[PDB]
Amino acid sequence: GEINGPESVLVNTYQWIIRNWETVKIQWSQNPTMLYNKMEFEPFQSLVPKAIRGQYSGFVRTLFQQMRDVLGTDTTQIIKLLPFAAAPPEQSRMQFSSLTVNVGMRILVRGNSPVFNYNKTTKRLTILGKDAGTLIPDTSGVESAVLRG
């Protein structure tokens, strides 16, 4: 884990999700609030602007409810959005294309950003230029035909 201030809070939160991904995936499927309401996400929540925390949580929880109902368990997207579900949700009709953390820096809802960057070839997640670990259901990590020899 990292120790440099707000940045480290971000990196460390996504490292925790990756390291605990089996238990997180099952809880997200079966009983998501034991996950959304975990104290693990309190530091991440303090980085989200106070005036919009609840509106972001309403958006992500609603998105997850719809995802789950029609598709079940997109690993990268569940990991990305999860910490934003931690605040008490405020429901609204607002549709967010990005979500800000104070470190504003933007996490894009679809695809990669300077803050959150998943690499399909190495199968590792990078947060603010630091490694968060390897992402995974049926050998993990780097693809074939990367190392020439």
Author numbering: 537 to 609, 611 to 640, 644 to 676, 679 to 680, 683 to 693
From the paper:
Each segment is packaged in a ribonucleoprotein complex (RNP) together with the nucleoprotein (NP) and the three subunits (PA, PB1 and PB2) of the trimeric RNA-dependent RNA polymerase, which mediates viral transcription and replication in the host cell nucleus. The PB2 residue at position 627, which in nearly all human and avian influenza strains is either a lysine or glutamate respectively, is the best characterised polymerase determinant of host range and virulence. Here we extend the structure-based exploration of host determinant residues through the identification by random construct screening of a new PB2 domain (residues 538–693) that contains position 627 and is thus denoted the 627-domain.
To assess the structural impact of the typically avian glutamate at this position, the K627E mutation was engineered into the 538–693 construct, the corresponding protein crystallized and its structure also determined. The structure of the K627E mutant domain is essentially identical (RMSD of 0.34 Å for all Cα atoms of residues 539–675), with the Glu627 side-chain (not visible beyond Cγ) again pointing into solvent. This basic region is severely disrupted by the charge reversal upon mutation to glutamic acid.
